[PDB]
Amino acid sequence: DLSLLDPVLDEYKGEKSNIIAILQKTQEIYRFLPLDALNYISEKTGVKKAKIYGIATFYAQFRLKPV
Amino acid sequence: MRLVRVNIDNKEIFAEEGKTILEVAHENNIEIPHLCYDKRLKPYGACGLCVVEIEGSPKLARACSTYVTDKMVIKTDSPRVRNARKMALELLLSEHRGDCRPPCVLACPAHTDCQGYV
Amino acid sequence: MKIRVGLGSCGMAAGGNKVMECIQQELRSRNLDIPVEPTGCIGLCFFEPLVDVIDGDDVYTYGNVTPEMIPKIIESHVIGKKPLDEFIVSTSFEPYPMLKSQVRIALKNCGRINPEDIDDYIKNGGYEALKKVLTSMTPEEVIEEIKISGLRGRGGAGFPTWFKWDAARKASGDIKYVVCNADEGDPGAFMDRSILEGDPHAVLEGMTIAAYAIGAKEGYIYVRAEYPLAIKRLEIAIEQARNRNLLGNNILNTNFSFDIKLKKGAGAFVCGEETALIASIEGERGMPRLKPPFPAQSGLWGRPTNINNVETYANVPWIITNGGKAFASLGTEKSKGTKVFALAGKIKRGGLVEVPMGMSLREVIYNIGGGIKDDKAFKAVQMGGPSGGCIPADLIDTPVDYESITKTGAIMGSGGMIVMDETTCMVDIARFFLEFTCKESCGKCTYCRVGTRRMLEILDRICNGEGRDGDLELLEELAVSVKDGSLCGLGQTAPNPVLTTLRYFKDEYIAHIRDKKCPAKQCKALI
Ligand SMILES: NC(=O)c1ccc[n+]([C@@H]2O[C@H](COP(=O)([O-])OP(=O)(O)OC[C@H]3O[C@@H](n4cnc5c(N)ncnc54)[C@H](O)[C@@H]3O)[C@@H](O)[C@H]2O)c1
Ligand SMILES: Cc1cc2nc3c(=O)[nH]c(=O)nc-3n(C[C@H](O)[C@H](O)[C@H](O)COP(=O)(O)O)c2cc1C
Ligand code: SF4
Ligand code: SF4
Ligand code: FES
Ligand SMILES: [Zn+2]
């Protein structure tokens, strides 16, 4: 699913400096950061995909595998 | 503008303000190692190969970021600088998986470029 | 009567939530109308869960309170108007000896008030420093007051705060920020988490005074997202303060305007660094940038920002209300004021301690900490955290001070002193904290990214006994090269354990590598 992230992306829109909060919300929702969800964030918010993956893999709290 | 008077490797230089030590040394034929420096990009400071010893400063200063000031004495080949660069290069090599020359070249007593002409 | 329950993160896991629920149910059963309010950690974490009953001015604390013991407390003190004295540990008549040798400035209201009530902080003299600043003061006078007070550091840095304020306010630009460093990267130190959960309004008042002294109109608090109680308390405090016109635009009917937004870090040790904090707020990975361009001159989005710890912000309002001279009369000549430490390890009584600067480490370990657990010999203190050093037994008399602690190699750091006995082996401890720092590096510069790993494998080879010759000299040279070559403070303070364990406990390493055994008998591979 991708509509679950629709409220979050609507709350943190207008500024591309809130990507970590969106990633944390996605981590809470899906329990992990699937590449399709990261793609949806990259498309909706307008931040480059490499930045998304870097900020996602920087922290040990973010896991990219299903739990 | 003002012409700053610096001294790099016992050679007096009249450089221009707002210049980094790397640019001054490049334009005055002084070699400073650098791996993470490009003219079109802002300084990074990762490799730490361009460290130079500046008189009056306790720590080695990166030549890619430090700006030349007036009355600056810079030593780019002091033993402290050489040890720092050697340790940085050893640390970089510790995680390097490569082959500078193939085993065919190394086995030849004349070290002919076997891979090249093959 | 006024019932208060320790509801801080500390009490929560201890069972404070269940204690509060049970006491509310008991009061409902006996149809008693008593105000039950939460309160933060008072420093006696080992006594939690804690219940404090207030009558007039006197307070009675019940150590290790339990739901089954609540009805006895209600029927004795609340109903019978008679102290039980069988479970009461401390009272206003006689404070606990752990709290007699502490002076408290940052934690003065931590654990004695209601965090979710602005009026409770107001009635304790709060938000009067802000009024005095707003009416009969000017920003230059605020800089001068902080400078006279000698306040500095409190994040382990030790830099004068007045200098940062002056640099921020003098810097070019019409928009300036004020940030608060509340990301406690060191696991084992919770001074500012406790301050945010217990007394969150001193942080706001200090931030507002700093913004007045600097010329800021926006504020940020960088609190980790792993502190949910701290975030909740901070949000409640911010909303209540905005209700009283003590925050937001037009504070106290003046032209001064200041508002605070909350940033939740994902959680990373290096993100606590100023520059990495700035990058994380900007929305990028926490990679520290070069220092000479300073946040006071170019921080968030290129505009001057003032980044300070929670403790210094908490000390600011006390400085303003009592004057700089009163603050400067506490501590040594180099370090003024009080400092907060998190005693842990083999100490008898762990928790938070606010001690004057210059108080000897032996006094903190024995007089305040209660001595070593099980009365064993005291080997070393791992001061500063994973990037601190092991101050040995003979240096137990080095006074608490930035200069005096640093002269021994260690750093003030996150104030987390890990007390250790003669049972602990030094090689494993050095390898333990170095492993953490190597895991927490960001990987930008070669010296910290790969040098720390080489040190970790060298230490592992030493501990396993499989180390070759030349390991000690190579390890020392690697540590001093990483320390003098790394870019940020996480690499320059990364080899602090090793170096310190090579200055006082070289013989431990030598016996580890040559005799293939450890005197402390803690290495599993050698027992
Ligand atoms: N809290 C922890 O868990 C923890 C962990 C490791 C280290 N530490 C401590 O924190 C320190 C971090 O070092 P750092 O590099 O962040 O501090 P630093 O010594 O580079 O400077 C500290 C502060 O001084 C300011 N400053 C310095 N010169 C200035 C100038 N000319 N103008 C304006 N501002 C100026 C900096 O901006 C910063 O706010 C370490 O030395 C260590 O003792 C704490
Ligand atoms: C790895 C690392 C972690 C740090 N963590 C903190 C921290 O959690 N809180 C803090 O106030 N400073 C921390 N610092 C120090 C900051 O870089 C900076 O010195 C601090 O925000 C200055 O605050 P002060 O002026 O109140 O002393 C850390 C530094 C490093 C290198
Ligand atoms: S192996 Fe290749 S990349 Fe590595 S040092 Fe040799 S030439 Fe350079
Ligand atoms: S020392 Fe480590 S954490 Fe600091 S910038 Fe270098 S690689 Fe990153
Ligand atoms: S060229 Fe790498 S630090 Fe300057
Ligand atoms: Zn051992």
PDB file of C-alpha atoms and ligand atoms in Angstrom, chain B residues 22 33-37 45-50 62 64, ligand 5:
ATOM      1  CA  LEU B  22      46.367  24.754  -2.041  1.00  0.00           C
ATOM      2  CA  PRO B  33      48.893  15.953  -1.918  1.00  0.00           C
ATOM      3  CA  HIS B  34      45.120  16.016  -2.236  1.00  0.00           C
ATOM      4  CA  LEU B  35      42.489  13.415  -3.073  1.00  0.00           C
ATOM      5  CA  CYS B  36      39.138  15.001  -2.150  1.00  0.00           C
ATOM      6  CA  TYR B  37      39.683  18.490  -3.602  1.00  0.00           C
ATOM      7  CA  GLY B  45      38.071  17.633   4.326  1.00  0.00           C
ATOM      8  CA  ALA B  46      37.743  13.845   4.150  1.00  0.00           C
ATOM      9  CA  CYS B  47      41.063  12.429   2.948  1.00  0.00           C
ATOM     10  CA  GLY B  48      43.296  14.642   5.079  1.00  0.00           C
ATOM     11  CA  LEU B  49      46.234  14.432   2.669  1.00  0.00           C
ATOM     12  CA  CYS B  50      46.670  18.201   2.219  1.00  0.00           C
ATOM     13  CA  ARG B  62      44.192  21.432   5.598  1.00  0.00           C
ATOM     14  CA  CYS B  64      42.263  22.793   0.691  1.00  0.00           C
TER      15      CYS B  64
HETATM   16  S1  FES D   5      42.199  17.486  -0.176  1.00  0.00           S
HETATM   17 FE1  FES D   5      41.342  16.047   1.248  1.00  0.00          FE
HETATM   18  S2  FES D   5      41.321  17.135   3.162  1.00  0.00           S
HETATM   19 FE2  FES D   5      41.928  18.641   1.679  1.00  0.00          FE
END
